[PDB]
Design a protein around this ligand. Structure first.
Ligand SMILES: [Ca+2]
Lengths: 223, 12
């Protein structure tokens, strides 16, 4: 996260880190046994790390649980990033409390201008790289679909939205992929792609979670 | 470039 702030320990209790011997993506806990992340984050050997703040120090609220199932949307296109969503089933249920908690799925899509919270352990620099120890946060608005399309001609599908800034300096970046965009207490977005990070006129692009609620519920029910 | 914020990035 570029241009953001230190969240504070366990203030984003649905935020998870996906770990394969290193942090490589974020995700969002949606019930005690399931996480939502980006399809582009798929790999074998995922360990889900819940209750993290400092991802480099064991502090006491961590739960480390192996993925049992990692389910990429059947229509994910890796060239366009359409349908950039994956469901991860945990091998055992997480213990839910104030510091490890699920986030609600949307009952409707969010409107342009709605302020959202974007979080992750990604890069905090727009030029070069620096990776934080602790979780970072950014408040960012949903942009109009026309502004999104003007920014990214020919590239924005009905399953994507833009959030953030056009003036530069505030965005999700390397290591934030798969993580949450939460608006009014609902998971509306997944960190998906952009042209660089925090560049002028190039806002972040996010998977539009409200389109997938029925798919998520059916997938969980059947697995 | 057009890239994902994964480690490593996926760019296009
Ligand atoms: Ca830790």
């Amino acid at each position: 996260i570029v241009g953001g702030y230190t969240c504070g320990a366990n203030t984003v209790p649905y935020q998870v880190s996906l770990n394969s011997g290193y942090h490589f993506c974020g995700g969002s806990l949606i019930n005690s046994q399931w996480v939502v992340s980006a399809a582009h984050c798929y790999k074998s050997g995922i360990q889900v790390r819940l209750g993290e703040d400092n991802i480099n120090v064991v502090e006491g609220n961590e739960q480390f649980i192996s993925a049992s199932k990692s389910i990429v949307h059947p229509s994910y296109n890796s060239n366009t990033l359409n349908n950039d969503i994956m469901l991860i089933k945990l091998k055992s249920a997480a213990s839910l409390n104030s510091r490890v908690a699920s986030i609600s799925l949307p009952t409707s899509c969010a409107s342009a201008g709605t302020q959202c919270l974007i979080s992750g352990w990604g890069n905090t620099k727009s030029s070069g790289t620096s990776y934080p120890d602790v979780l970072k946060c950014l408040k960012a608005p949903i942009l109009s679909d026309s502004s999104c399309k003007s920014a990214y001609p020919g590239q924005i599908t009905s399953n994507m939205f833009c959030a953030g800034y056009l003036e530069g300096g505030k965005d999700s970046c390397q290591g934030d992929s798969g993580g949450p965009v939460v608006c009014s207490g609902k998971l509306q977005g997944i960190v998906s792609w952009g042209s660089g990070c925090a560049q002028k006129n190039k806002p972040g692009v996010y998977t539009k979670v409200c389109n997938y609620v029925s798919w998520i519920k059916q997938t969980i029910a059947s697995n | 470039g057009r890239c994902t914020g994964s480690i490593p990035p996926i760019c296009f």
